[PDB]
Design a protein. Sequence first.
Length: 15
Amino acid sequence: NGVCCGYKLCHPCAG
């Protein structure tokens, strides 16, 4: 769906 930032690292959440 897009990019998500969590543990100081942004990565695709679920496309």
